[PDB]
Amino acid sequence: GKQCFVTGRKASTGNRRSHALNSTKRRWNANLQKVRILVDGKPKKVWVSARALKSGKVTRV
Amino acid sequence: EARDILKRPVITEKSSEAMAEDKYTFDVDTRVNKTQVKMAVEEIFNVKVASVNIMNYKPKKKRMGRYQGYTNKRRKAIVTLKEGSIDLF
Amino acid sequence: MKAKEIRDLTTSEIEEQIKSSKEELFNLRFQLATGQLEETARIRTVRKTIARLKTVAREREIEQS
Amino acid sequence: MHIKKGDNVKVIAGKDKGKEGKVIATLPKKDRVVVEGVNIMKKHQKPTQLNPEGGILETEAAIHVSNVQLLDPKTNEPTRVGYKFVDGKKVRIAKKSGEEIK
RNA sequence: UAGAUAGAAAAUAGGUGCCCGUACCGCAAACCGACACAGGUAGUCAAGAUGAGAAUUCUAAGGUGAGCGAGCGAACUCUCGU
C-alpha cells in the first residue's frame, strides 16, 4: 500500500523477458522518496515520487 | 413478572415427599436466578421462604414414529418455606 | 373481552385488567398442572384478551407520540 | 358450494340416482355433502369401543357435491343455481323457474 | 508515604449471599478402536501371610463366573506335561 501522496504514482505489473522470450512476472516500482511536506497545514513525512518533486512543484518543509 | 417466573408446580413422588417437609417444587423460567424465584413465590402465595434450591435439566431426546427431537430444557426450583403453606390443590 | 370494550376502558383500567387477566391465566396454568382444569379453552381465551389489552395500550401510546 | 345444509336435493349420479333428501352436512374442503338415506355404509363397530353396544353400523356417507342438484321449488325438478343481487343481498335463483331457492 | 476526610468500632443482635457443573459409565459392553471388539486411555487409594519389595504364591475389602451349549475323547493343528 505504498503510493506517491501527491500524484498517486504506484507500482505496476508487467513481464521480465529473456532473449528466448521466456516471460516471468515482475513489478515496476515508483521512485518514492520519503519527504517532509505540509499536509493540512502541518508538516508530515510522506512518500512522494521524484517526478512530483521535480521542478519544485511540491514544497518540502 | 412473578407469574412469568413460576411456570407451573411439579407433582411427583419425590416432590410430594418434599411437600411433607414444607418444600415445594416448581418449574421456573430458564433465565431466572433463585433470588427472583424466592421473591416471586413470596408475592404470589404470600408466604415466607426459608431457602431456594435450584437446578437445570438438560433437553432430553424423544422419538415419535420416525421423527426424532428433544424435550424443552427445564429449570427446577425447590422452595423451603419458613412460614405459611402453599395449597397446590 | 373484544377490543371495542377495551377501547372504552381508561388506560389505568386496561392496566388493571392486564394484571387481573394475568393472575387468572396463572391460576388456570396451575390448575391444569394439578389436573384440576377441565375447561382448557379458558386458558387461550384469557391469553387473547391480554394480547388485545396490550394492543390497545400500544395504539394509544403511538397516538400520543 | 352452491348446495347448503338443509337443502332438498335430487341425487343425479351414483347408486342412489333418482333419490331426493335433505343435506345433513356439507364438507367444503372435500367438496362433499351428506344426504339423508344416501350412500349408506355398514361400518363394523367394536362393543369393546366406548359405546357399550357393538356391531355393524349403518350411516350415510359423504357424496360429491357434483352428484347432487337442487330441486326447483315450483316444479320440483333438478335445476342449476344462479345468483341475483336484490336490495344489496345476493339471492340463490333457480334457473328453471327463476324463483328464489331460499 | 502522595493524597482523602470525622468519623472509626472490640463486641452484641438480626439479616443477605448469584450463575455454571453435579445423573450415570469412566482399564470400559456407556470413552478412542465400523462390533456388547483379547488393543489404547492421565491421576488418586490400595489390607493380611511371605518377602528387600508395589516381586512371588495364597487370601481380605470388594467384585466376578465372562451371552451358545451337550456329547465323544479319531486323524491333523495349536497350548501344555513327561
Added chain:
RNA sequence: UGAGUAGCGAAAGACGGGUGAGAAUCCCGUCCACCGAUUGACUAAGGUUUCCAGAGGAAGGCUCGUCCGCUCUGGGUUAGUCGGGUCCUAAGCUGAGGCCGACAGGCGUAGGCGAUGGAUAACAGGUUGAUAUUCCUGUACCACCUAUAAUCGUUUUAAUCG
C-alpha cells in the same frame, strides 16, 4: 453357489427353589471357582440420559431369553464454603493508535483474553428406587448489610481510609 459349511471373540460351574406359553441361559439360595498394586474404591477426559421404577419381547444381543446398556411409560442431578465464573497471571492468542504490504492482508505497542500453575470461607453423622462436603441433623467458617455499641477521634489534623 460355496453350506447347514467356517465361526459364535482369552475364563468354572453345579444343584435346589421360583416365575412363565416356553428356562443350560431370568430371579433367589447353597456349594464351588476366579481377581485381589486388583476383574476392588475413586476421579479427570470423553460420552451424553446410557441412571431409577414399572411394563414388554418384534428388531438389537453372535444361542436362548420370562432378561438387558434394547423397546414402552413415568421419574431422577438441590452448594455463600466442592470444581469453574463475578480473582491472578504463563506459553499462546488478540490488538486502539502504529509499521509494512498489488488486493486480500502481515506484523506489532498500550491494553485485553488465556490453566496445565498462584490466591481462595464446612465438617461429621443420617437419609432415597434413583442426589448429596449440595437434602436433613448437629456443630462451624467467610464476605457484606442494618441496628445498638465498651472505647477512640473530631479538620496543619494524628482517630480513620490510603
Added chain:
RNA sequence: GAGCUGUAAGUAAGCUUUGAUCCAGAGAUUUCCGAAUGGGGAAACCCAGCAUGAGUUAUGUCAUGUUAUCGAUAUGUGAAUACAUAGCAUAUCAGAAGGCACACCCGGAGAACUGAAACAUCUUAGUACCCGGAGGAAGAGAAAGAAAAUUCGAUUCCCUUAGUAGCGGCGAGCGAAACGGGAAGAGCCCAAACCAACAAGCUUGCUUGUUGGGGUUGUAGGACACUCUAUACGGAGUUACAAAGGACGACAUUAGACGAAUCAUCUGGAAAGAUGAAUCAAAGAAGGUAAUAAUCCUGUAGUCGAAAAUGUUGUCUCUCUUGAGUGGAUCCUGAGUACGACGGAGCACGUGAAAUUCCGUCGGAAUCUGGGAGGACCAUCUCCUAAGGCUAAAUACUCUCUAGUGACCGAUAGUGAACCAGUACCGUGAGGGAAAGGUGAAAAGCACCCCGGAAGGGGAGUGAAAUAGAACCUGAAACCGUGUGCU
C-alpha cells in the same frame, strides 16, 4: 358467507350469521445469536459501568434506557516547547460496516493440465481461481473521429464486410476494421481570458486567495468593443443539461363478483360410454365428478369490482432562465502535459518498416503564422482541436414474482431431493452424500366366532374386487418349494 380451532387422525374444551375460520391492504408485537457494536466468549452464553425506576430496615436482587470502532462535523483543553501542534475529552450524524443472484458489469492480480502429435517462442488464456467496486444494468459516449465522396457527423448493439486484410518457431494456431444494411438516438456542463465584491501582502503599486458573474469552441470559439432583443413574454426541468415540493385525474398491481346450455334408456358398483332425442357457444381451454362430460361441479369467453397501499402517467402548480448579430487591435482556449529515450504492456498486429495507446524511470514542447491525425518518416493536402467532467435509449443477465408454453421426464427417468434431503450416513475439518411414490369411488380400514401368550391364520362381514387388508394397482425373471405324466 358457514362452518371453524394447520399437517394430523382422535379425544377434550370451545368459537362462529351480534359474520368464525379464510383471503387482500395497512399497522402492532417481534426472545436470543449473528456485522453484533458496553466488556469478554468455545455463536445462540457469561460479566459490567452509568442514569432512572421497583423491592428491601439495609445489603443482595430486578426493570428500562444508555455505553464498540472508524469517519465526518463541531466544542473545550493542550506535551516536549514561547507561540500552538500533537495529544486528550465531549457532543452530533438513518455516515460506514455485514449479507447476498454459484448471473450479468468494471477493475487488481493471474495458473496449469492441454494444443503444437516432443518442446522453450507460441497455445490453453487474460480462461479458472482469488480480491476490490458496484449498478439495475455496467461500461462507452458528443471527434485532436472515420475517411478520401456530390463526404460523413457522439456512444452502444445486430447483420455483413471475412475466416478476408493481416499476425505467426510464417508452425500449431490467432484474426480485425472502415464501408454498406439495421436497432436506438440527445445532447451538455466546466478551466482560462475579463468584470464585481471581500480578504492578505498594507506602495495603502496592484499582485495574490475566496465568492458571484462571464464563457465553452474548429464554419475556430470566447473575452473585448459595438448594435439589436428580453426581464419570464416566451423557453426549459428534477433521465444529463440547477434543484426540492404540492393538488387533481387516469391507468395498472396487490382480495374478489356475475357468468350460457341435458335429459331418457342400456351395461355397470358407479355413466361422462353406447343408443335416442335436445340445448348453448364472444364459452368445444383445462381440471374434477364412482369409466371417456361444451350443457354435473370448479371454470372458460365476456363483463363487472377496491376501503387501503404501491407503481406508472397526464394536466396544473412549482422551480429555473434572456436570446442574436458585426469587428478584426489585444487577451484566453486544460504542462511536468504532449512528446522522446530505455524497460514492459495493449492494439487481430509475437518489435517488426510499427503508426495508433497506456505504465515505470529519466529527459522534456508549441501556443491559432498553434497543435493532433491520415500505420515508419518528410512535404503537400485534407480532416480534427488532446492533456477537465456529465449524459437516457437500443445491449447483458435472472436469486425472484405473475401468466403461460413444450413431437421435454415420468420414480434406476426427471433436480442430489415427487417422500420431513443437503436429511440419514461418512469425515478432525474443508467436504462427500444416499435410499425411499401408488388400498379403495368412498375408510365403507375386517363387528363377531374359532386356534394361538403373541405373531399369524380359518371363518363371518365391508366392498365391484380383500387373489384391493396397510411400502395394501399391476406383479416379469433369477431363486425357493409341493404335487404329478414319462424317465
